[PDB]
Amino acid sequence: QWALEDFEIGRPLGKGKFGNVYLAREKQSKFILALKVLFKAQLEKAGVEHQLRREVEIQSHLRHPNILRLYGYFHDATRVYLILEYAPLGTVYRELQKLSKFDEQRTATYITELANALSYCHSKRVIHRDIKPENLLLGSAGELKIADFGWSVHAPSSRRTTLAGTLDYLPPEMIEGRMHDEKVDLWSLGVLCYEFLVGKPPFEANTYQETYKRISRVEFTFPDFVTEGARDLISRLLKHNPSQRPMLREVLEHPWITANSSKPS
Ligand SMILES: Nc1ncnc2c1ncn2[C@@H]1O[C@H](COP(=O)(O)OP(=O)(O)O)[C@@H](O)[C@H]1O
Ligand SMILES: Oc1c(F)cc(F)cc1-c1cc[nH]n1
Ligand SMILES: [Cl-]
Ligand SMILES: [Cl-]
Ligand SMILES: [Cl-]
Ligand SMILES: [Mg+2]
Ligand SMILES: [Mg+2]
């Protein structure tokens, strides 16, 4: 159906391990979108064909205001193209670098929108497993949208693929290679809430080996400016035992969240 000749390519929106994303306009309809380009040679070499298929299958059927939409796909003899919803206000990662830290209002609002999207996902037993600032995009009204479902699966699960980059957002059970479920996204939610308020993840470190150690032993401390409400929520989410981590309904109903968020459930 679709082909490259149907689109006019614009400026680069960003780059990933495989994905090179461009702004694009469909010629006949003038529809503005984002074109995620992946090279087949790199996909085969890394052997992550199954990850790409999962990303397409899972994200294309999901329908939620806080989840980035996937419209379709096509390919030539060298590349695979994903037709994505265009997010005009960029990434949370960029916004965080710009402001260094978020206030309590901005943080609680983001967490609320994340919890809503994750609640929708977990209802279909879909785990994201790769929640981090660079995979969180912003809509025209500044609303948060979860993207990059390349690592997403169905619960329960083990890990078949090699961990590539940072360990900063992964729970102990994932890095130790043990079996895991939906509770891993709530660990990441705690890491995110910390980084939003502080400016850096709680287990950040100089080396892979040491970051591993701090995560497995849950070694983190709060700066003095972190309020008691934020500390309570973060401490509940960052539990070593997955079953002790709260439900998403508990997060959405937390007194600190309800007092500072500007969005409802
Ligand atoms: N729909 C989009 N709108 C705007 N920017 C995007 C969009 N999709 C991706 N990007 C940019 O491209 C980067 C990589 O996209 P992503 O799909 O996460 O690639 P990868 O899966 O290789 O990490 C993101 O960090 C973001 O900055
Ligand atoms: O060609 C593809 C496609 F059309 C859809 C999809 F999800 C994946 C692929 C793919 C993965 C490795 N080679 N090709
Ligand atoms: Cl690629
Ligand atoms: Cl498995
Ligand atoms: Cl895997
Ligand atoms: Mg990404
Ligand atoms: Mg990816």
Please state the domain extents for the chain: 2-90, 91-261
Q: Resolution in A, one decimal?
A: 2.0
What technique was this entry resolved by? X-ray
Nearest CA-CA partner of 79 in 27, 137, 1, 21: 21
Three-point CA angle 33, 56, 91, nearest 5°: 50
Does ligand 2 have an atom closer than 6 angstroms to the CB of 50?
no
Q: Enumerate residues lining ligand 1, CB below 6 A.
A: 13-14, 16-19, 21, 34, 36, 68, 84-87, 91, 134-135, 137, 147-148, 150
Task: Pick 91-261's CATH classification: 1.10.287.40, 1.20.120.420, 1.10.510.10, 2.102.10.10.
Answer: 1.10.510.10
Mutate which of 137, 144, 161, 169 to test ligand 1's pocket (most atoms within 8 Å of Cβ)?
137
Give the closest ligand to the alpha carbon of residue 150.
7
Give the closest ligand to the alpha carbon of residue 159.
5
The residues, any chain, with a CB within 8 Å of residue 260's CB and separated by 6 or more, are 104, 105, 107, 108, 109
Cα dist from 13 to 31, 94, 138, whole Å: 17, 12, 13
Nearest CA-CA partner of 19 in 60, 51, 64, 62: 51
SS3 annotation, the chain = CCCHHHEEEEEEEEECCCCEEEEEEECCCCCEEEEEEEEHHHHHHHCCHHHHHHHHHHHHHCCCCCECCEEEEEECCCEEEEEECCCCCCEHHHHHHHHCCCCHHHHHHHHHHHHHHHHHHHCCCEECCCCCHHHEEECCCCCEEECCCCCCEECCECCCCCCCCCCCCCCHHHHCCCCECCHHHHHHHHHHHHHHHHCCCCCCCCCHHHHHHHHHCCCCCCCCCCCHHHHHHHHHHCCCCHHHCCCHHHHHCCHHHHHHCCCCC
What is the 152 CA–ligand 4 centroid distance (Å)?
Answer: 12
- Can 2-90 and 91-261 be said to share one CATH topology? no
Q: Which residues are catalytic?
A: 130
For helices 183-198 and 104-122, angle between their N-to-C axes, nearest 10 degrees: 170
What is the 111 CA–ligand 7 centroid distance (Å)?
Answer: 22
Cross-strand bridge partners of residue 39: 79
Give CA–CA dist 245/87, Å, rounded.
31
Does ligand 2 have an atom closer than 6 angstroms to the CB of 43?
yes
Q: Is 116 annotated as a binding residue?
A: no
Side chain identity at 235, as an amino acid letter? S
Peptide bond into 255 cis (omega under 30): no
Give CA–CA dist 189/235, Å, rounded.
11
Give CA–CA dist 68/108, Å, rounded.
20
Give CA–CA dist 132/260, Å, rounded.
22
Residue numbers preceding breaks in the chain (C to N > 2.5 A): none
Give CA–CA dist 131/150, Å, rounded.
11
What is the 158 CA–ligand 2 centroid distance (Å)?
Answer: 23
What is the 128 CA–ligand 1 centroid distance (Å)?
Answer: 15
Q: Which residues surround ligand 5, an ion (CB under 5 A)?
A: 159-161
Contact 53, 150 (CB under 8 A): no
Q: Is 20 annotated as a binding residue?
A: no
Cα dist from 8 to 29, 68, 90, 233, whole Å: 12, 22, 20, 46
| Residue 142 exposed, middle or buried by CB count within 10 Å (0-12, 13-18, 19+) | exposed
Cross-strand bridge partners of residue 37: 20, 81
Give CA–CA dist 130/151, Å, rounded.
6
- Please tell me the number of Cα atoms within 13 Å of 102 on its side-chain side: 24
Give CA–CA dist 187/106, Å, rounded.
20
**Length of the chain as a residue count:** 265
What is the 224 CA–ligand 1 centroid distance (Å)?
Answer: 34
Domain 2-90, second-level architecture: 2-Layer Sandwich (3.30)
Report strand pairing: 79-84 vs 70-75.
antiparallel
Contact 132, 258 (CB under 8 A): no
Q: For ligand 2, atom 5, which residue shows the shortest CA distance?
A: 53
Which contacts (CB < 8 Å, 24+ apart) does range 144-148 have? 144/66, 144/92, 144/110, 144/113, 144/114, 144/117, 145/66, 145/67, 145/68, 145/85, 145/87, 145/117, 146/66, 146/67, 146/68, 146/114, 146/117, 146/118, 146/121, 147/68, 147/84, 147/87, 148/16, 148/55
- Which ligand 2 atom lies nearest to the CA of residue 55? 7
Q: Is 87 annotated as a binding residue?
A: yes
Q: For ligand 1, atom 22, which residue shows the shortest CA distance?
A: 16
Give the closest ligand to the alpha carbon of residue 160.
5
Give CA–CA dist 181/156, Å, rounded.
5
